[PDB]
Design a binder for this molecule. Structure first.
Ligand code: ADP
Ligand code: ADP
Ligand code: AMB
Ligand code: AMB
Ligand code: K
Ligand code: K
Ligand code: K
Ligand code: K
Ligand code: MG
Ligand code: MG
Ligand code: MG
Ligand code: MG
Ligand code: MG
Ligand code: MG
Lengths: 368, 368, 368, 368
């Protein structure tokens, strides 16, 4: 039942992603000394100017200059011409820091969860490739293989699909668009060649690459001093690339900068968890689990499972499977998913869903 | 086939929405003197401090101080204690301004369109009520009826649904959560009373209000000097409240601050247009039109119509109806939808979809 | 030998003085926990926006938000309409803090010292009155006597003089100009009346007030919301009001924000000390002591005493008196003057010279 | 009657001087299109971040981004590593611009004027050399002779003097301290050599250089990426280097950023004018003219001439000479000195007094 789809992703150098990372880095820095630290911060950046804003109630001694500059260094901004230098950039900290199981969900909410068997990660091929494409470039950048490669990048992958008496089977990569920052001493012809052979063909399964697949490598020409400006980078502005690439559903809640007590993060992770668990347990090929919460109440206020006719069990057979295998209460979620651990910075880029190294990405058994 | 859903919206005073408005105000200010002005700007705010960033190639004389301060005044920030005063706030302008039909879509893209017959607006009841709830408060604020009401507000509406051999029929409003900024001389009991009688009951159809409907008016108690602070307002961070309240699909593209040449805005409007047109023409009760574009190419690179079995015509009968009634090429879209007109500021709040006063909200005939 | 002179001063609310105070407050906050803390910081402010910049090598735990906001509170900025509110203003801290007798003067330098017997403070009448005028207003503000009085103020005092076979004898106050911020509910007529009777006549000696003395109270009309904006306040920009009101000599070195190891502060204090000591010891009626230092060298590189023929001893009789009573080496200065003590904030306003509560203002014995 | 003196100066790259220049550049940009433009602005800078503040009532179309970036380019900040790049730095404009002979002096004031015959410029040798030293470095920088030389520099010159039955005769240059920013590929030994032979010996008269003259070239070693940072550049903070190097007297008024209607600038220029005219006319070898103004009154409120016994005419013989040759009323000053002309930027560095290319530096005839 043919149709096409496109998804995108950005590198660690993208202005918005730098803020997402810095904000989560401050979250990690607090969890390490106070696992109950209440973190609510965000970052704004603009050409060698980083602004740390936020309200965080914690009891840990943190050097914000150090956590911000270290994060910029990690990203790869050490030289001047790159558009950012952790040693010279302005780090304005306007941060306000205080000191002092059946909890109860804060703020009326509605979290979504999604999973599909088109890839081993249980994530849309389009967004998976988009992420992996950026990931590979960072590897070649940090390894030395492609030393002209710079931190800021953007990726777009559009794959042609076809339904299947249930749902969504990828057929081939229609076109790929990739833009990456770079050093001066490297020709546009050499860049485009490396992007096709060393990054694209090294991550995209042969089955999907074609003789017609369209490539748009460095479409706009040169992207040299295009360091983090992009007319002001911000936290929580890359909401769709952090989730499913526009495949599931999104209420609008941002992750980065918020601790484990905010249902926007925790519950969203929990919902992905159950979704991935369901398909992994063969109970369906594609699911859209919807979990709703009521302010004050701990136990979820109605969970809805949305298979697209890919399940044999039948919604409201699968719901009981979820109700007998999962306890989606806020407090239990953080305990079961080990959400007090400082893993948030690595979650701040290349997507929150998909990577198995995250608790919520480990499928639960599901006793049926 | 019961399930519940929740959606939210924010007032003109919300930090993020102030930026969305200011950014679009600068867009309007340019279109009025140069309908071909290339606008790409964004705003950041934080307690009497507004930062205007951006790259805009236009040929019109604009007083950015005036357009920013006027927008803050319009919103209702004239006094000190409100958290913003257009006469005293810091307006730092770091804006860069230059001077000098079958076009071709910029940037690979995938826009979504959505419509449902559950309301006359052809928008989800949950998001429509959420918006109207905030709209009414602004009216009572500007009229004088409720003089304690301040610009910043947040609304959440959760409605209980039930499918129907096709899709989505609202049954009743399960719960409503509304928070609004206010003046000191007004009791929490008087506020909650006015919110239920004068705002909620004056906008929510009797059919949906119940004896069990849950109300959470000013849950967190007071919200006096709150105003636009919420440690850092930003543009393009309220992506879901600007669209369908998490009902359709979203690729992640922001509207505010971008001119009509960006497919993220134009094509998204066009997609809503056709969706609304389809249901209005009786061709379906609920649609999710998906329009894809290829960088360089003008004609859309595959459009997909997604009815949920609510159509009698049958997808790929409806596609020809769309292909015979619509010309979704970027240039044609702006011409047909009159996208060079300065209506963007009013689009910057209370949602981009739903209100009939916008070109894309006027259903096309559809000759079938 | 008639001639006239004018001097000025500013209140604790003046933008520049707020920065001078905040910078010194950060200096005090460090000295209290580490008397060897190396402080080199400065502040910038602009309508509810304070920027703390600087490089300080110390080993003490300081809450910069607390020290900045407390200083703003002390000044009298607690309400919104005043142009500053310590509870709501933006405190952006871009501060960089590290951790780890015959010293030797840093940086080639030339410090000046001045004293005259026209007042008991050994300071020019014009600047003394200018300071005292602002001091009295702060008293009436903090006492409650004049509750309409606000933090920001400016004072100018011009006195008619006459030489005397030596130098400088004040005759009368020619004119006085005073401007002070205020609350809305207070008439211009009532303000001007209070300024003449309660502030001017309560500080200016009867001997100097005349029937012709010119008064310019609130010349520009109303100064209400004129809170700290004055188009950006800065540290070290009020160099002359911090010293002699344009009577001695000034090399251009700023005090506020610099610790006791900077000769610009210490040596300047030392020079005032000896000047005050000389006149107090009857060795002259007016002196301009000039102390020069050589980078690397501890012992001063030539000190020059400049009496205006008011001494009977004779320059190079008085020099030996200074060389036998004073050891102006940097390290000795800080030890003798107790410069590791946190008294710098109170030195940040109303003048560094004149007030007896400061070590350098206590005349040394002088054995001759 | 031996004594020594020291003075200093800074290059066009010094943070404070960049602001003084940018502020005056905005003043020039307005005078060119509206000679009656009311300018009152100031600048603040900090590592690739320039903040333009101010209130200017004018009727001219100015591109502040252009005038700020052009000024930074002129100074020599075009590359990244230099600590500033006009193409990449953040120019935040928070400027507010409106549109719409016997005047009368604004603000009680007291301006000073100074001149001495020790140099043809009628300025202290110490400050003249200090300025010329920095000037030469800029020449060699812009010519190409010393291509490692960067914009930011600081100079100090200390000369040994001796009175002369009147006053002040320079004997020799005791020591010279010069620090200048530089490129990486240049040894400390090569820099110090070039500074002595190519800059110092090329500007300092043979008569003053000795075999004992002390040189401190690049004392603190390297100064590479230093540039305009020095944690926070400001306007009006280099008050003494803009005048007489601590030789005359200074009331504290800043020049840069203020138009010709502010007596702080105009009257100060006028006072220098008469001082230079007096010594040039042989009426004295050293003068300190003191001009006082009364708010509201046009005609100066008492002018005092202070020769140090270097005149044969006798104070109050010279006063009549001044009263018969000069009309120091504010309006007349601007007319006679052509103060509506855009020459203020070149006045913003290397000193306001001394250079003959300025109106106030052209001696008036003086008919006696
Ligand atoms: N997703 C979220 N859900 C709930 N609270 C949040 C979230 N993100 C941040 N916060 C909270 O909001 C505060 C920061 O924003 P702010 O609105 O300025 O506080 P205030 O209204 O008191 O000024 C933090 O103290 C933090 O605990
Ligand atoms: N009057 C002064 N005399 C000497 N050093 C000073 C003075 N005021 C501040 N400083 C020093 O200069 C430093 C702050 O300015 P900065 O020029 O940015 O350092 P850098 O050149 O390493 O970037 C501080 O670390 C402080 O010790
Ligand atoms: C007490 O509730 C306060 C604030 C609110 N939800 C906002 O800043 O958006
Ligand atoms: C190593 O000396 C450095 C810097 C210099 N005096 C300045 O910033 O002004
Ligand atoms: K966020
Ligand atoms: K977004
Ligand atoms: K200073
Ligand atoms: K000054
Ligand atoms: Mg709540
Ligand atoms: Mg808010
Ligand atoms: Mg929201
Ligand atoms: Mg030194
Ligand atoms: Mg410097
Ligand atoms: Mg200096």
């Amino acid at each position: 039942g043919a149709f096409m789809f496109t998804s995108e992703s950005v590198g660690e150098g993208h202005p918005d992603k730098i803020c997402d990372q810095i904000s989560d880095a401050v979250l990690d820095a607090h969890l390490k000394q106070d696992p109950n630290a209440k973190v609510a911060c965000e970052t704004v950046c603009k050409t060698g100017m980083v602004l740390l804003c936020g309200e965080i109630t914690s009891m840990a001694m943190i050097d914000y200059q150090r956590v911000v500059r270290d994060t910029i260094k990690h990203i790869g901004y050490d030289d001047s011409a790159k558009g950012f230098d952790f040693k010279t950039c302005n780090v304005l900290v306007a941060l306000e820091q205080q000191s002092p199981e059946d909890v109860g969900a804060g703020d009326q909410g509605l979290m979504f969860g999604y999973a599909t068997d088109e890839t081993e990660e249980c994530m849309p091929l389009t967004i998976v490739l988009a992420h992996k494409l950026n990931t590979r470039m960072a590897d070649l950048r940090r390894s030395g293989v492609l030393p002209w490669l710079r931190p800021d990048s953007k990726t777009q992958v559009t794959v042609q699909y076809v339904q299947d008496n249930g749902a969504v089977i990828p057929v081939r990569v229609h076109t790929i668009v990739i833009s990456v920052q770079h050093n001066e001493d490297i020709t546009l012809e050499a860049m485009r060649e490396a992007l096709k052979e060393q990054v694209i063909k090294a991550v995209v399964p042969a089955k999907y690459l074609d003789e017609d697949t369209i490539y748009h490598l460095q479409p706009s020409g040169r992207f040299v001093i295009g360091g983090p400006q992009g007319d002001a980078g911000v936290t929580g502005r890359k909401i769709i690339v952090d989730t499913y690439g526009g495949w599931g559903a999104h209420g609008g809640g941002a992750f980065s900068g918020k601790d484990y007590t905010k249902v926007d993060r925790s519950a969203a992770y929990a919902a992905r968890w159950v979704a991935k668990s369901l398909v992994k347990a063969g109970l369906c090929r594609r699911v859209l689990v919807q979990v709703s919460y009521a302010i004050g109440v701990a136990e979820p206020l109605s969970i809805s499972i949305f298979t697209y006719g890919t399940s044999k069990k039948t919604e409201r057979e699968l719901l009981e499977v979820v109700n007998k295998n999962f306890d989606l209460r806020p407090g239990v979620i953080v305990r079961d998913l080990d959400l007090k651990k400082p893993i948030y910075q690595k979650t701040a880029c290349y997507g929150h869903f998909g990577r198995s190294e995250f608790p919520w990405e480990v499928p639960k058994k599901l006793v049926f």
